[PDB]
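PT: before anyone asks, these are the final sequences, not the draft ones from last week. 439 residues across everything. Please model them as a single complex and drop the result in this thread when it's through.
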Amino acid sequence: FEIQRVESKFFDLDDIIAKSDSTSCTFEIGDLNPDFFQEMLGVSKPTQNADGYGVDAPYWLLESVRSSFSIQLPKAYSVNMQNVLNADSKKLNLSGLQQHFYGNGMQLCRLMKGENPDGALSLARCLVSTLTQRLGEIVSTATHLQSKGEKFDSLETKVFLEGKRCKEDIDTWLRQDN
Amino acid sequence: DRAEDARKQEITEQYLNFLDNQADTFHYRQKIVKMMNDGESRLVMNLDEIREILPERAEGLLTQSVLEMNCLQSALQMAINRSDVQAVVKTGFHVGFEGTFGERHVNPRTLKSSYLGNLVCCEGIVTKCSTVRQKLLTSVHYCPATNKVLEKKFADFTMLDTAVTNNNYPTEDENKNPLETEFGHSVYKDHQTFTIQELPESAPAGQLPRAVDCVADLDLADRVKPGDRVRIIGVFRVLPNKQNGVSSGSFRSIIIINHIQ
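LR: through. Structure below.
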């Protein structure tokens, strides 16, 4: 009977699914045992170029790699897309791009801090601007009876559900008084 | 009015600074040099690239598209005049667009009257074509009685320029001397119209497919034939009509094309 203190979101299924995603990355040739690609990733032979072994790896595994490695940003977080989303994200379908958009962005910033501080800071600024462009639309959209929240992220879904719950409660109280 | 002139001067100055920046990060000056070496007369721009450096221009270029586009083409002419290469082409220089449209990516079914006056991008299949025909733009005349040269300009509702004039062909001097047309100095342009229909993979079942009419001029003519699958960028606009001073309120609408993919 001994106790181990852990993260406040240790049991969260959404957080486990967010950790289970994978990103494209590259490892230096010969600096890691090539048993790794069969042992962890199940890949018989790494794909190889002049820059290194090129693979995809999950975030839970990537936090454990104290060796050297490098990250390539996925399609939804590429710099052209960053310019598009920073320009106008008020009506875009973020769930079509990624169901764990802001969470995977925050994971990418924490990983990229050691390689590329300027790129990490740029992506963080983009995330703040993107959420600021959309929160008011979410809180307004929750008040309609016909809304169903098709386009929103998992993070935005919490705000949407709370707003619709409050609207249902006050409408039920009002319609007693006929 | 003078505030409108000041704003147009500011907008043209902003577009000119973007085009002819001292160290061009988007290389449109080098693309202008390529254009004038090749003898072409329109320049293709990324609206997503304008969106980064001048977003207040780029989003206004969709809603208030006519004034912004006129200012941009004026800035292009001044940027060309700063070069050491000469402007051979008697027609002016023009601009086409590419990039991300979002709200204004539409079909012939979804083009409706809310979009009138806006820049749009539309998709479909070419179903008709007119033959290419020539249209008068300016006329040059010689007065043999006085050795003077007269000129006149013409305009039409299908042109992007909103200005209108009498459109009578001149035949006599103000002193009622007769005039002679100079065919080697008068200016004409190639002109074509066509129509596009909904793609068969998108039209809902049972119903008839819907369609839209299109106008193309200059280097954009003679580019398509029936059956082509195309994506077309232009301004959606409406055309009035008259018969004996009585007007039916039902007007016709077209797309005036900037660019074809």
